[PDB]
Design a protein around this motif. Sequence first.
Motif, PDB file in Angstrom:
ATOM      1  N   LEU A 108       2.222  11.779  -7.965  1.00  0.00           N
ATOM      2  CA  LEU A 108       2.955  12.567  -6.978  1.00  0.00           C
ATOM      3  C   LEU A 108       3.547  11.719  -5.853  1.00  0.00           C
ATOM      4  N   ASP A 109       3.343  10.398  -5.901  1.00  0.00           N
ATOM      5  CA  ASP A 109       3.888   9.495  -4.900  1.00  0.00           C
ATOM      6  C   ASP A 109       4.261   8.211  -5.623  1.00  0.00           C
ATOM      7  N   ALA A 110       5.564   7.990  -5.839  1.00  0.00           N
ATOM      8  CA  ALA A 110       6.032   6.853  -6.616  1.00  0.00           C
ATOM      9  C   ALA A 110       5.625   5.533  -5.962  1.00  0.00           C
ATOM     10  N   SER A 111       5.374   5.546  -4.646  1.00  0.00           N
ATOM     11  CA  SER A 111       5.053   4.317  -3.938  1.00  0.00           C
ATOM     12  C   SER A 111       3.672   3.786  -4.329  1.00  0.00           C
ATOM     13  N   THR A 112       2.811   4.637  -4.899  1.00  0.00           N
ATOM     14  CA  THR A 112       1.447   4.236  -5.224  1.00  0.00           C
ATOM     15  C   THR A 112       1.458   3.123  -6.278  1.00  0.00           C
ATOM     16  N   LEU A 113       2.019   3.406  -7.456  1.00  0.00           N
ATOM     17  CA  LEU A 113       2.052   2.418  -8.522  1.00  0.00           C
ATOM     18  C   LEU A 113       3.014   1.277  -8.178  1.00  0.00           C
TER      19      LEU A 113
ATOM     20  N   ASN B  33       1.144   7.659   6.489  1.00  0.00           N
ATOM     21  CA  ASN B  33       0.928   8.957   5.868  1.00  0.00           C
ATOM     22  C   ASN B  33       2.071   9.323   4.915  1.00  0.00           C
ATOM     23  N   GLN B  34       2.561   8.340   4.149  1.00  0.00           N
ATOM     24  CA  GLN B  34       3.653   8.527   3.207  1.00  0.00           C
ATOM     25  C   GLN B  34       3.160   8.282   1.781  1.00  0.00           C
ATOM     26  N   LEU B  35       3.885   8.779   0.768  1.00  0.00           N
ATOM     27  CA  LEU B  35       5.057   9.630   0.922  1.00  0.00           C
ATOM     28  C   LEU B  35       4.611  11.074   1.151  1.00  0.00           C
ATOM     29  N   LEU B  36       5.076  11.656   2.267  1.00  0.00           N
ATOM     30  CA  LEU B  36       4.881  13.062   2.610  1.00  0.00           C
ATOM     31  C   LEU B  36       3.416  13.490   2.503  1.00  0.00           C
ATOM     32  N   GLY B  37       2.507  12.634   2.979  1.00  0.00           N
ATOM     33  CA  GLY B  37       1.104  12.988   3.115  1.00  0.00           C
ATOM     34  C   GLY B  37       0.287  12.733   1.851  1.00  0.00           C
ATOM     35  N   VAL B  38       0.906  12.161   0.809  1.00  0.00           N
ATOM     36  CA  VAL B  38       0.207  11.919  -0.445  1.00  0.00           C
ATOM     37  C   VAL B  38      -0.510  10.572  -0.355  1.00  0.00           C
ATOM     38  N   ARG B  39      -1.830  10.598  -0.564  1.00  0.00           N
ATOM     39  CA  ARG B  39      -2.650   9.403  -0.504  1.00  0.00           C
ATOM     40  C   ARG B  39      -3.684   9.474  -1.619  1.00  0.00           C
ATOM     41  N   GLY B  40      -4.124   8.306  -2.089  1.00  0.00           N
ATOM     42  CA  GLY B  40      -5.184   8.230  -3.079  1.00  0.00           C
ATOM     43  C   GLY B  40      -6.464   8.893  -2.571  1.00  0.00           C
TER      44      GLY B  40
ATOM     45  N   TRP C 141      -5.737   1.649   2.016  1.00  0.00           N
ATOM     46  CA  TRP C 141      -4.366   2.094   2.177  1.00  0.00           C
ATOM     47  C   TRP C 141      -3.420   1.072   1.576  1.00  0.00           C
ATOM     48  N   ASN C 142      -2.400   1.569   0.877  1.00  0.00           N
ATOM     49  CA  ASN C 142      -1.217   0.768   0.630  1.00  0.00           C
ATOM     50  C   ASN C 142      -0.316   0.865   1.862  1.00  0.00           C
ATOM     51  N   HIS C 143       0.800   0.135   1.813  1.00  0.00           N
ATOM     52  CA  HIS C 143       1.631  -0.122   2.976  1.00  0.00           C
ATOM     53  C   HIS C 143       2.195   1.157   3.582  1.00  0.00           C
ATOM     54  N   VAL C 144       2.462   2.192   2.770  1.00  0.00           N
ATOM     55  CA  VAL C 144       3.080   3.382   3.339  1.00  0.00           C
ATOM     56  C   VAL C 144       2.039   4.495   3.516  1.00  0.00           C
ATOM     57  N   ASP C 145       0.842   4.362   2.922  1.00  0.00           N
ATOM     58  CA  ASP C 145      -0.266   5.228   3.306  1.00  0.00           C
ATOM     59  C   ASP C 145      -0.563   5.100   4.798  1.00  0.00           C
ATOM     60  N   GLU C 146      -0.296   3.910   5.356  1.00  0.00           N
ATOM     61  CA  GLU C 146      -0.576   3.612   6.757  1.00  0.00           C
ATOM     62  C   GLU C 146       0.200   4.537   7.696  1.00  0.00           C
TER      63      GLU C 146
HETATM   64 CA   LIG Z   1       0.798   7.348  -0.390  1.00  0.00          CA
END
Ligand SMILES: [Ca+2]
Length: 319
Positions: A240-245, A290-297, A283-288
């Motif tokens: 649900l968050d392309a930035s994760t992978l 709260n991205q993308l749009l609040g999606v975090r592992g 956290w990855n770089h954009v979890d810091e």
């Molecule tokens: Ca994220």
Amino acid sequence: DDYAATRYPIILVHGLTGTDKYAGVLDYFYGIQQDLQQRGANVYVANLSGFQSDDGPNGRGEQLLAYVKQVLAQTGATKVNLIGHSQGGLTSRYVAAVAPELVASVTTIGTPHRGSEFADFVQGVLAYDPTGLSSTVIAAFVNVFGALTNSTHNTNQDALAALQTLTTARAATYNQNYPSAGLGAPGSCQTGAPTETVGGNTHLLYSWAGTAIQPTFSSLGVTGATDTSTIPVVDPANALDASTLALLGSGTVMVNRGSGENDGVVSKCSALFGQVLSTRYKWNHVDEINQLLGVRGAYAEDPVAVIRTHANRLKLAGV
Ligand SMILES: [Ca+2]
């Protein structure tokens, strides 16, 4: 309530690609301004070039300085608290150096104080360009993205300048040009002092880092990496968050370039500044932000709570 009610206004300072609100509708610091304001903070969000250097007449530093002056005029305050994500931490350092009297504190979140091995890699690829044409076109795609998504369609976008700024060699020069007592010695992977006083003006200095991306195995010149923010394989964030992978991928490149633990684009060592509150966040770089749009592992901390607690920390510290 007044849990986050600091004496001086907070300015959130975005990094690379950023703006206050993407397309005028999606906050860069997702959910954060709203949360802080509910807890009594006076919070402003800078809108700078998504792609630029921090120094220079046209750079982000002078842009932030102008915005700081506007916030002070608007509020009647004498100083501001700067909280910068990623390159925004460098921008915040610029303003604290050139106008120290206007700044009460500098907090950096995942800031590449020593640059990014991923930036070095990209720059290294572009160095093979025989004419400059490929590089010009690549930059144009990115510059167009910046102008398109900036809330006020800021056309001051220079992707190649931004790239250069985030390389390790350029960051080392930046640190020589804009030193801070908050920085440890180059090469030391240590932090500096928790405060600085500059031209009679004291600043409280803080940082934290995300280290979701961890080195694993090592064999015959190859290092593995894992994303410790996620349930292996089937974490919702992988879907649900392309930035994760994506950031696991870039983070794996980083470990193979000697970065150690990182957030996908910034190493733990690079992120160290001032009072280091933690480098353990999953956290990855954009979890810091709260991205993308609040999606975090599933194993990620809540960055909204972390920033809120920091606003309270600032209040307790007298800023
Ligand atoms: Ca994220």
